[PDB]
Design a protein around this ligand. Structure first.
Ligand SMILES: Nc1ncnc2c1ncn2[C@@H]1O[C@H](COS(=O)(=O)NC(=O)[C@@H](N)Cc2ccc(O)cc2)[C@@H](O)[C@H]1O
Ligand SMILES: Nc1ncnc2c1ncn2[C@@H]1O[C@H](COS(=O)(=O)NC(=O)[C@@H](N)Cc2ccc(O)cc2)[C@@H](O)[C@H]1O
Lengths: 318, 318
């Protein structure tokens, strides 16, 4: 049902147990979660993929849990990161943390009773957790041997040149715990994220099992890349922040207009709520049209509106 | 001077910088430490060797710091251990800790003046420490790459049959910090322990340099064993405790008088305070004297009074 729908949009990289998950979603609504760490004072175009995905689940009747890593942001996810990351002050992360919560809010119905959205922060629990407690209760459930051969950190370990701190090496446990913790108190049985996050989610489904014996689920969406395999979110001036202050609505819309013909269609699937059908209709319509492609105009309008409301769209054009 | 004196009786296995440590010990009295983890309600003969080196250094005028791992004993030191030590309740361990402390107190002088002994417990700084505080303020200084190859745990990894949890894999950072922490509040510049405790010491040396920029040293005593090969401190009823209740003064004295001829002399150098001279005369004497060796008798008289006092001795005689 739903999974298959997302597959049609090409928004599904890997699924831990497609069937069981598919069957579970069927039984009735569930609660899922997606996490975002405070690396900046705003999220960017990349983050909008998973985020928009929660909303997609919500509309299918599920309850989204949007979690900001108030704690993991003090450590740093080393997942597929080639080089160690630098630690940001406790005060700066806080500030950033707050800008994100608020920034994420507008993207989800936080009131419709049943499946109203939930904002969550792991600082809530890791923030005042004794180190010994953490090592004992969670640590005893992780094997360094296998922690070592996880794709998300494998390479940094095997390299007489590269390396990784004990700190970021532990990152895995905290996100892993977050799952079990969000499951214990909210019934969250699904965690979604971009491909890179897989390993982190994996550890999460495992801890949740050995701590509460609950079959939990994981589902990742591919990391969206420009067709010409360049970057994304990044341009000549930097990341396409969602924060109007960092990227004007006018500039934001101009961005989508400039999409390549080999992307615009996929991008309409990843960023808009257009019936996979009409998107194909639009493609076909554009192909046989001796006219210019209108897909970009669509894409630009839809996203600029999702991210900035009619106000921002009105601005985008003046 | 002192370093070489301890070598005379083979109580030194390694030293971080013999030359410099030698020069430093000469400059004047220093603060040194040795730690003992609560893994039972009592210590055994193996623990005595190191403990005795602390009293040695003290007689030489230095300040002994006797630490008890109220926190480490909750994590489990994996050093050269074959299988994962299991966790003990917080309840049990604190109970063992008191025991070990009080048991330890008699062996060191707690009021000779400037070099009076200090009782220490790392639960003091780990019991109330945030995990995020730990992982970043300390973790950030440990390379998983270098951690994986450290001898004390190269075993557990690089093996199919074995394994190590994230918990015990973290032990190194705790003892490493204990050194730094001790160096900052007592100016402790020396950490002595058994051969197996080396790597743990090293890591302390570095963190101390890395966190305070001070040259700190480490020296390990050889792991005393029976020349015949078999494990030390073991019997039919197992380990020989220092707790009269676990091992009566009588049984204790008997264990000593039963010492093998190839061990008895070394044992006099390790477990007693006889000068290397008289211990050598004794060996010589025993050599060409139609009588039975009296070193056994001596050794038992000494160690028995050391560990149980005049009462304990007179008791091993009835
Ligand atoms: N270009 C992109 N396309 C698709 N997805 C993308 C993307 N760029 C980022 N993302 C995804 O959207 C999120 C972006 O935030 S993130 O900083 O990368 N998140 C992280 O690093 C996670 N460790 C955060 C986290 C997740 C769960 C927790 O319980 C705690 C923390 C991630 O799930 C990432 O996989
Ligand atoms: N048979 C033996 N011969 C000589 N020395 C021996 C011995 N058996 C044990 N020892 C030494 O005497 C001590 C015995 O206690 S122990 O439980 O093994 N100690 C430990 O495991 C350390 N991790 C304790 C510790 C040390 C320093 C800290 O800052 C914190 C904790 C260690 O220094 C050990 O190396």
């Amino acid at each position: 049902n739903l999974i298959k729908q997302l597959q049609e949009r090409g928004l599904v990289a890997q699924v831990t147990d497609e069937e069981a998950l598919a069957e579970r979603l069927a039984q009735g609504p569930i609660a899922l979660v997606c996490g975002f760490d405070p690396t900046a004072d705003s999220l960017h175009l990349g983050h909008l993929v998973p985020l928009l995905c929660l909303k997609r689940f919500q509309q299918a009747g599920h309850k989204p849990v949007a979690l900001v890593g108030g704690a993991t942001g003090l450590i740093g996810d080393p997942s597929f990161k080639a080089a160690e990351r630098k630690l940001n002050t406790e005060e700066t992360v806080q500030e950033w943390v707050d800008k994100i919560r608020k920034q994420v809010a507008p993207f989800l119905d936080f009131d419709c009773g049943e499946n109203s959205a939930i904002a969550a922060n792991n600082y809530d629990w890791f923030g005042n957790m004794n180190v010994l407690t953490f090592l004992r209760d969670i640590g005893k459930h992780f094997s360094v041997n296998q922690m070592i051969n996880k794709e998300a950190v494998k390479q940094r370990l095997n390299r007489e040149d590269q390396g990784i701190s004990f700190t970021e090496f532990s990152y895995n446990l905290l996100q892993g715990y977050d799952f079990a913790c969000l499951n214990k108190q909210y019934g969250v049985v699904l965690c979604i994220g971009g491909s890179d996050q897989w390993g982190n989610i994996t550890s999460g489904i495992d801890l949740t099992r050995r701590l509460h014996q609950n079959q939990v689920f994981g589902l990742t969406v591919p990391l969206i890349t420009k067709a010409d395999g360049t970057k994304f979110g990044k341009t000549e001036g930097g990341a396409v922040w969602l924060d109007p202050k960092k990227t004007s609505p006018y500039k934001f819309y101009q961005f989508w207009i400039n999409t390549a013909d080999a992307d615009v269609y996929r991008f309409l699937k990843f960023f808009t709520f257009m019936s996979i059908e009409e998107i194909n209709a639009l493609e076909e319509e554009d192909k046989n049209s001796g006219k210019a492609p209108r897909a970009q105009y669509v894409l630009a309008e839809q996203v600029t509106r999702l991210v900035h409301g009619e106000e921002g769209l009105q601005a985008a054009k003046r």
